[PDB]
Amino acid sequence: QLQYTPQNRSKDNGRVVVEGVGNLMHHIARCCQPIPGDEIVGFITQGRGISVHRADCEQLAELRSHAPERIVDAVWGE
RNA sequence: GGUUCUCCCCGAAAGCUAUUUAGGUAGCGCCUCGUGAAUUCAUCUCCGGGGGUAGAGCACUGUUUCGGCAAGGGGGUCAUC
């Protein structure tokens, strides 16, 4: 009965700062549920902007098997 | 319900079928007596047989667990026309 505020803060910006840039259309993945753990690794998607597909994950590595240029680092900050 | 003298020989059935039949009856099965014929009949060993039961098996009809490969659908990844 109790079933976006947690992602309204990402919609309120901050968090991810890929290569030192702020306010990006980032969005956490799924197969991997990244949290500020093994940091993370970003990935540019056609639409949806940056996909934070966690650091070290198969599907991320698959993308590492396709277009490496799309691949980007990742951080957290606060 | 009961059915009164005596000895002798053999000696059943409580089954099938039908029955406004199912505790009755009839045909037949088994009884007895009489007559008449096949070494006809019974056991046995040898011989020629069909069987699908026990048992066993899982090719088939089903059922069952496990391991394998893996359709194909599910959830996600880039995609999402």
UniProtKB/Swiss-Prot annotation:
Changes seen on gene knockout? A slight increase in biofilm formation in a csrA-disrupted background; when combined with a spoT disruption (a ppGpp0 mutant) there is a very large increase in biofilm formation. The ppGpp0 mutant makes decreased levels of CsrA and its inhibitory small RNAs (sRNA) CsrB and CsrC. Deletion of relA alone decreases persister cell formation in a hipA7 mutant; the double relA/spoT deletion obviates persister cell formation.
Q: What does this protein do?
A: In eubacteria ppGpp (guanosine 3'-diphosphate 5'-diphosphate) is a mediator of the stringent response which coordinates a variety of cellular activities in response to changes in nutritional abundance. This enzyme catalyzes the formation of pppGpp which is then hydrolyzed to form ppGpp. The second messengers ppGpp and c-di-GMP together control biofilm formation in response to translational stress; ppGpp represses biofilm formation while c-di-GMP induces it.
The UniProt similarity line reads: Belongs to the RelA/SpoT family.
- What's the protein called, per UniProt? GTP pyrophosphokinase
